[PDB]
């Protein structure tokens, strides 16, 4: 059975590759040659968020568009008021090492994850005090890399064991598990409709997973290195990936292959954080050379550079209305650019 | 009122400074090795589902944090980037002369890592008694695994312990040279390796780690206090 198993696998791979090639008529570069370029854009650091101890790995933006949660490996979760720079909460964590943090759309709960293989859920509206430990989402055999909130009761966690799991807060058990990936999953993003989500793993493949069905629909293998950050286009249909190959590639769920790649000869460092502006033109990618580069989604042009950080910009997030971008780096400071 | 929010932020500032004093005064250590390595015994030698194990031990008024990531996937190229703030990485090498080549490969990967290029690593060659008895038996074909051992000889500057067979010291120093060559291949000098000898029962491991951390902090002070 084995020989024809690989034979059929290779035949299906070739068939899908040929179908994708035939599905390509004109590249995104050619069709967008006539569009007006964004040009050089300069954004200043409006707010610097001093107060964190260790290097900062992840951050997230709330639906109120001015409250953000910053996760640092010092063992603290901090909610920063972007408009007024004051700190709303300072959550002490059970484990110092954390690799992700999530802000619920309703704002009632905040989550985090790391090397503990446990997603810690913290509530903010509790009358008993400031912050209390809701419950631990134990069950993962790999280090958690990225967590996002669908609702107040549904959360999806990406762990370093090739498994993506959807957890129910009320029950505290794995509702559904996804094991289609072959490498360590580094990031996941949720579409605005909360019906589809894509997870990037350390296998140069981005897989679209169904929150309800639980089946993997599309796999995008256009990369050549480990994908670190993945995030949807605001339309909820396309997405882009940032890998260690110093190139950013945009994928759409209709074409099922890469549309445009973002790269430069002067960049030899990988991408660890990626996000889109609300219009989607400004693709923000966090590189390893201590700065953030602004990439035009439809033109692949260097619109601008955010060189306000002296260390790796591990995390990057954009407000739900696109008012400003808070970039967190390993210097224990968050810089908000507008 | 926003003034009360500012007061709360100032209280959070005070708390963050108060526990940042503790965070700065404490020292973080990373424990790494292999399945055959005696990292499980080293942890038990320190006395005052989860992917990372935290161990508390203090010697001479200073406390240390060791993190063991044994219960994790072996694909360690990603979570290792989180340990940049760690003062030193404790490496355990099994001297079963073969998992030694894997130990050298892991040491090379750690030393040449971009994020780990500013971190000194402490190497502990555990189970030295097993290596000594194996090389005393003579059935081990150590020359076959490493052809360099055939021509290498014990340096005149060696300091063997009393009651130690000369071939035991020769093999130990050959392993030390094999690790030191990888350590000094880069030649940057930002971080320094600390070869050491240890066994399953050794109460001086804490003292050795204390001395290595002291030397590392001295080098850091030279780097940061305009003294290098």
């Amino acid at each position: 059975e084995l020989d024809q198993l690989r034979q059929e696998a290779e035949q299906l791979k070739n068939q899908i590759r040929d179908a994708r090639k035939a599905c390509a008529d004109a590249t995104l570069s050619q069709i967008t040659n006539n569009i007006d370029p964004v040009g050089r854009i300069q954004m200043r650091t409006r707010r610097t968020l001093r107060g964190h101890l260790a290097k900062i790995y992840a951050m997230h933006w709330g639906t109120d568009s001015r409250l953000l949660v910053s996760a640092s490996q010092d063992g603290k979760l901090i909610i920063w008021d972007s408009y007024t720079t004051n700190k709303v909460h300072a959550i002490p964590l059970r484990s110092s090492w954390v690799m992700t943090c999530a802000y619920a759309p309703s704002g009632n709960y905040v989550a985090c994850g790391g090397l503990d293989n446990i997603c810690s859920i913290y509530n903010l509206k509790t009358r008993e005090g400031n912050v209390r430990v809701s419950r631990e989402l134990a069950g993962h055999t790999g280090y958690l890399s990225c967590c996002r909130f669908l609702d107040d009761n549904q959360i999806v966690t990406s762990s370093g064991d090739t498994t993506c799991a959807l957890w129910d807060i009320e029950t505290g058990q794995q509702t559904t598990t996804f094991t289609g990936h072959t490498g360590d999953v580094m990031s996941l993003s949720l579409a605005p409709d909360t019906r589809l989500f894509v997870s990037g793993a350390c296998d140069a493949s981005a897989k679209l997973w169904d929150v309800r069905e639980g089946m993997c629909r599309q796999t995008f293998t256009g990369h050549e290195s480990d994908i670190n950050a993945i995030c949807f286009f605001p339309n909820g249909n396309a997405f882009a990936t940032g890998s260690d190959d110093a190139t950013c590639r945009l994928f759409d769920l209709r074409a099922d292959q890469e549309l445009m790649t973002y790269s430069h000869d002067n960049i030899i460092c990988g991408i660890t954080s990626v996000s889109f502006s609300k219009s989607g033109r400004l693709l923000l990618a966090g590189y390893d050379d201590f700065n953030c580069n602004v990439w035009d989604a439809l033109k692949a042009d260097r619109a601008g550079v955010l060189a306000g950080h002296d260390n790796r910009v591990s995390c990057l997030g954009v407000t739900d209305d696109g008012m400003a971008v808070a970039t967190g780096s390993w210097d224990s400071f968050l810089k908000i650019w507008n | 009122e926003d003034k009360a929010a500012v007061e709360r932020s100032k209280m959070i500032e005070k708390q963050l400074q108060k526990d940042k004093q503790v965070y700065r005064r404490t020292l973080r250590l990373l424990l790494l090795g292999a399945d055959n390595s005696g990292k499980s015994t080293i942890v038990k030698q320190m006395r005052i589902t989860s992917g990372i194990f935290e161990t508390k031990f203090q010697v001479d008024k200073v406390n240390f944090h060791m993190f063991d990531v044994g219960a994790q996937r072996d694909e360690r190229r990603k979570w290792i980037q989180c340990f940049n703030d760690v003062t030193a990485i404790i490496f355990v090498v099994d001297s079963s002369d073969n998992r030694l080549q894997e130990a050298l490969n892991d040491f090379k990967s750690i030393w040449n890592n971009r994020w780990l290029r500013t971190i000194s690593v402490i190497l502990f060659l555990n189970k030295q008694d097993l290596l000594a008895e194996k090389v005393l038996a003579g059935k081990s074909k150590i020359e076959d695994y490493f052809p360099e051992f055939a021509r290498y000889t014990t340096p005149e500057d060696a300091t063997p312990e009393p009651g130690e067979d000369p071939r035991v010291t020769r093999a130990k120093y050959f392993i030390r040279k094999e690790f030191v060559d990888i350590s000094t291949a880069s030649g940057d000098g930002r971080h320094i390796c600390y070869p050491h000898f240890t066994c399953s029962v050794d109460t001086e491991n804490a003292r050795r780690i204390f001395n290595d951390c002291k030397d590392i902090i001295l080098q850091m002070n030279l780097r940061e206090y305009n003294l290098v």
Epitope: T162, T182, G183, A201, C202, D203, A204, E224, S225, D226, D244, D245, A246, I268, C269, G270 | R73, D74, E75, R76, R77, E102, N105, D106, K108, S109, N112, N113, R114
Partner: nanobody, 128 residues
Framework: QVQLQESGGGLVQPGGSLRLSCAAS????????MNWVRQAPGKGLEWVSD????????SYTGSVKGRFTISRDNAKNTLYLQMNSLKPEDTAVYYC?????????????????????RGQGTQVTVSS
């Protein structure tokens, strides 16, 4: 997608010569450090030899030091490994593996838990 299609091998008499070739595709070959990893029956995966991006830095394991040589051809994106003085202990399956990130000297290909950037490999058997 990364495609490391190992070619060459088969049954060879001890002490003979054997060559293995890998058809690198889907990536820029010259920007990644390449190496060979073998898996023996009843044994774990071990690193064999590695070659730098430009081939200036080449290292081999002590078991096959000198006997084996590794060469790369960035023009056609192919990695070569010539075998000399085979011994019965060398029977195994060899996987051509690639470093995950470009412009780095790190090696994480020793892992055997379904590494993403290694090919299916070719089985080589030595027997009199």
């Amino acid at each position: 997608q990364v495609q490391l299609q190992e070619s060459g091998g088969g049954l060879v008499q001890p002490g003979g010569s054997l060559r293995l070739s890998c058809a690198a595709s889907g990536f820029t070959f010259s920007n990644y450090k390449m190496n060979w990893v073998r898996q023996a029956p009843g044994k774990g995966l071990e690193w064999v030899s590695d070659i730098s991006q430009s081939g200036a830095s080449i290292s081999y394991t002590g078991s096959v030091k000198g006997r084996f040589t590794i060469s790369r051809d960035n023009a056609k994106n192919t990695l070569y490994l010539q075998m000399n003085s085979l011994k019965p202990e060398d029977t195994a399956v060899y996987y051509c593996a690639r470093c995950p990130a470009p412009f780095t000297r790190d090696c994480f290909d020793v892992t055997s838990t379904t590494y993403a950037y290694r090919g299916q490999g070719t089985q080589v058997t030595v027997s009199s």
